């Protein structure tokens, strides 16, 4: 039975495509990518059609994890098809819950990705107005959370 996860952030050009790429690498490394549908989407329409922010690409290149995506906004269908929708911050979470209540079928469990962090850094903060170190922190959070999520979903 194929499992599925959608990572979600505000623009879908940084936090969620990083989480998506980190997770895809993890399952590929453990020989189970074929068992997973992995994707990412945005709560907003700010960046639809755009590639991941290059500041995030720079970070990912340093860690040797390839990343490619075209930003898209989450849709009503996503709530029906995904097992998990894992988002970055409380604002994302409130929007996703609002949207989920507008559809008939919500298969997805909607949660903060950070709820999986063994180090308990609950929020994955938007690094848009931040510096290199903020992108690195996002990356590290995604690694820790994705590993924990794969090991045992809530
Ligand atoms: O879209 C974003 N923020 C945002 C900030 C201001 C206006 C619109 C979007 C976020 C982002 C962070 C770093 C570099 C690019 C984008 S994301 O949610 O992580 O993708």
Swiss-Prot record:
InterPro entries: LMW_PTPase, Ptyr_pPase, Ptyr_pPase_sf, Tyr_Pase_low_mol_wt_mml, Tyr_phospatase_low_mol_wt. One of its GO terms (biological process) is chemical synaptic transmission. The modification Phosphotyrosine is found at residues 128-129. Changing residue 129 to F: Reduced phosphorylation. No effect on activity. Coiled coil: none annotated. Changing residue 102 to R: In allele ACP1*A. GO terms for cellular component: cytoplasm; cytoplasmic side of plasma membrane; cytosol; extracellular exosome; sarcolemma; synapse. The keyword Cytoplasm applies. The active site is at residues 9, 15, 126. Keywords: Acetylation, Cytoplasm, Hydrolase, Phosphoprotein, Protein phosphatase. SUPFAM superfamilies: Phosphotyrosine protein phosphatases I. Inhibited by sulfhydryl reagents. GO terms for molecular function: acid phosphatase activity; non-membrane spanning protein tyrosine phosphatase activity; protein tyrosine phosphatase activity; SH3 domain binding. It is found in: Cytoplasm. Its EC number is 3.1.3.48, 3.1.3.2. The keyword Cell inner membrane does not apply. Gene3D superfamilies: 3.40.50.2300. Belongs to the low molecular weight phosphotyrosine protein phosphatase family. Interacts with EPHA2; dephosphorylates EPHA2. Interacts with EPHB1. Acts on tyrosine phosphorylated proteins, low-MW aryl phosphates and natural and synthetic acyl phosphates with differences in substrate specificity between isoform 1 and isoform 2. This is Low molecular weight phosphotyrosine protein phosphatase. It comes from Homo sapiens (Human). The lineage of its organism: Eukaryota, Metazoa, Chordata, Craniata, Vertebrata.
């Amino acid at each position: 039975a194929t499992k599925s996860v959608l990572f979600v952030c505000l623009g879908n050009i940084c936090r969620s495509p990083i989480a998506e790429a980190v997770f895809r690498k993890l399952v590929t490394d453990q020989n189970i990518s074929e068992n997973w549908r992995v994707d990412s989407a945005a709560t907003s329409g700010y960046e639809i059609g755009n590639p991941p922010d290059y500041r995030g690409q720079s970070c990912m290149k340093r860690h040797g994890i390839p990343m490619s995506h075209v930003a898209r906004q989450i849709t009503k269908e996503d709530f029906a098809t995904f097992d998990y929708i894992l988002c970055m911050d409380e604002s994302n979470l409130r929007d996703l819950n609002r949207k989920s209540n507008q559809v008939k079928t919500c298969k997805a469990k909607i949660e903060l990705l950070g709820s999986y962090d063994p180090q308990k850094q609950l929020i994955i903060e938007d690094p848009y107005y931040g510096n290199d170190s903020d992108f690195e922190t996002v990356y590290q959070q995604c690694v820790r959370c994705c590993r924990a999520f794969l090991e045992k979903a809530h």
